[PDB]
Design a binder for this molecule. Structure first.
Ligand SMILES: Nc1ccn([C@@H]2O[C@H](COP(=O)(O)O)[C@@H](O)[C@H]2O)c(=O)n1
Ligand SMILES: Nc1ccn([C@@H]2O[C@H](COP(=O)(O)O)[C@@H](O)[C@H]2O)c(=O)n1
Ligand SMILES: Nc1ccn([C@@H]2O[C@H](COP(=O)(O)O)[C@@H](O)[C@H]2O)c(=O)n1
Ligand SMILES: [Zn+2]
Ligand SMILES: [Zn+2]
Ligand SMILES: [Zn+2]
Length: 471
């Protein structure tokens, strides 16, 4: 990939001009944002930026831009809608249901290849050469929107990076694309620092043995999922296992890094996993050490915890400095992490007996054993736990809140699988059109909803469609 950065920024400036037309008239800005760290930070960036202009706004945090959602937004009397961190795969639907409204899409998903009307403006870095999961996230698009609207919005650079980390834009251990420009803005203001550190959840709030035991991206062999063994390993290497990572000296951190790298090599971990163990970690002196907001991944996890309970609006308030919202959000992270480890335990126990393996895909139907909103994490964990061939994409389906006749599915894969030609977003979109469902997303990570009774048909279909992508 390679971004035309100034061309993208000129498109951003075009959207800023449109939103200013509505601010002048006192129009309330309707905001629809994705239910994850990327979308929650996106909405907070818009809330702070519009607040600086004295404009009013109304935020909803949602899972997807569905035809049903757009039917609802069609009847709302707002004059302008901003979709942030989602929507680029729903341009035809937005064109239909919001035809007589002004729409701004601040997003980084692979855009639907259709023509938009004059009052609908897509602001998407992928259209200017970006890799959708690496060069900029939804919070990043929203950040540059806010920055062009008012230069004072550069103080949102850390919140923007929180969304990027939540979206795993530094999944290979380093930041890329225009995320590096946001980082430079934040450094100039002194509100963020980039450290070369252990890229695991728990730098601020977890004891070291839980930082190691929670590691699923990448896993630490023999230690992941076993706090007792994590304690034994840490003590044997000379570390107080109850200490938090932020309490280690820089000398002690580097010693831990060496021990972990040697451990992964001795247990045969792959080069890709070793390379993303140590890398860019973003902290912020705006918050105290030991506070999850002090580090981007802990902050993103805190926001994801509010989204999981359908309290994304509380996550927005956390980003905006509401300390009472922060105290509530702290109480949601423990159940969030515990359920992920339980999902991994179920996968290890049931993968061999339940998974359907085609020529180009694994399809796992977990029934009700894993929450519908966790099937994506589960698919990724099947790869990281070594259950799945890294070159074969994994799709996990579960029963879902949304509909008793529906299955919610998530697809995940690796960069080496993408090198073979697979594109999960495109494959799921095309398969959904044939089994009376709905799907799409990134090449490396995508979602789909299908009727439960069409699962067997879907498995054969998606295997064939993925195979046709193999060049
Ligand atoms: N392999 C993986 C994949 C996801 N996760 C968790 O899932 C969260 C969000 O995952 P998605 O980006 O797939 O929605 C991450 O921030 C992390 O807490 C994990 O712990 N291990
Ligand atoms: N119909 C769909 C379903 C999911 N997606 C995208 O696919 C990605 C992964 O989906 P899940 O998080 O639902 O597994 C998300 O970025 C989501 O916005 C999409 O663009 N169109
Ligand atoms: N290298 C990467 C980068 C992102 N991802 C996934 O891509 C998705 C991006 O989230 P959105 O669809 O919400 O933008 C997340 O599920 C994230 O875990 C990945 O699976 N591998
Ligand atoms: Zn260039
Ligand atoms: Zn998102
Ligand atoms: Zn995103």
């Amino acid at each position: 990939s390679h971004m035309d950065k100034e061309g993208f920024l000129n498109k951003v400036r075009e959207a800023v001009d449109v939103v200013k037309l509505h601010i002048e008239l006192g129009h309330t800005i309707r905001i629809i944002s994705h239910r994850d760290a990327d979308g929650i930070t996106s909405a907070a960036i818009l809330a702070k930026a519009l607040g600086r202009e004295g404009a009013s706004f109304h935020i909803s945090i949602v899972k997807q831009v569905s035809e049903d959602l757009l039917r609802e937004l069609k009847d709302e009397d707002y004059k302008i809608f901003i979709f942030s961190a989602l929507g680029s795969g729903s341009l035809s639907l937005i064109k239909e249901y919001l035809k007589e409204k002004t729409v701004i899409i601040l997003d980084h998903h692979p855009p639907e290849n259709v023509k938009l009307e004059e009052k609908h403006i897509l602001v998407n870095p992928v259209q200017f050469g970006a890799n959708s999961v690496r060069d900029l996230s939804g919070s990043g698009v929203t950040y540059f929107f806010a920055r062009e609207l008012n230069e004072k919005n550069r103080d949102l650079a850390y919140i923007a990076i929180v969304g990027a980390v939540g979206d795993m834009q530094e999944n290979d251990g380093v930041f890329h694309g225009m995320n590096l420009d946001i980082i430079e803005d934040g450094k100039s203001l002194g509100i963020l620092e980039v450290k070369k550190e252990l890229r695991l959840f728990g730098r601020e709030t977890r004891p070291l043995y839980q930082m190691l035991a929670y590691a699923t991206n990448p896993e630490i062999p023999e230690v992941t999922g076993d706090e007792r063994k994590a304690i034994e390993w840490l003590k044997n290497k000379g570390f107080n296992p109850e200490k938090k990572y932020w309490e280690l000296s820089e000398e002690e951190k580097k010693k831990l890094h060496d021990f972990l790298i040697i451990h992964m090599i001795k247990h045969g971990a792959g080069k890709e996993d070793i390379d993303r163990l140590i890398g860019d970690v973003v902290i912020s002196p705006l918050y105290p050490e030991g506070d999850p907001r002090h580090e981007a991944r802990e902050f993103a996890t805190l926001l994801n915890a509010t989204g999981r309970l359908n309290l994304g609006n509380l996550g927005v308030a956390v980003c905006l400095g509401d300390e009472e919202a922060f105290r509530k959000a702290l109480k949601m992270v423990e159940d969030y992490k515990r359920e992920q480890i339980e999902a991994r335990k179920w996968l290890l126990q049931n993968w061999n007996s339940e998974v359907w393996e085609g020529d180009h895909v694994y399809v796992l139907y977990v029934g009700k054993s894993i929450r519908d909103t966790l099937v994506g994490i589960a698919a990724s964990m099947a790869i990281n736990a070594g259950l799945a061939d890294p070159e074969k994409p994994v799709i996990v389906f579960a029963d879902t809140d949304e509909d008793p006749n529906l299955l919610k599915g998530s697809a995940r894969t690796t960069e080496r699988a993408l090198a073979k030609g697979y594109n999960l977003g495109e494959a799921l979109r095309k398969a959904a059109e044939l089994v009376n469902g709905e799907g799409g997303g990134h090449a490396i990570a995508a979602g789909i909803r299908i009727p439960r009774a069409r699962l067997a048909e879907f498995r054969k279909l998606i295997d064939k469609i993925l195979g046709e992508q193999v060049s």
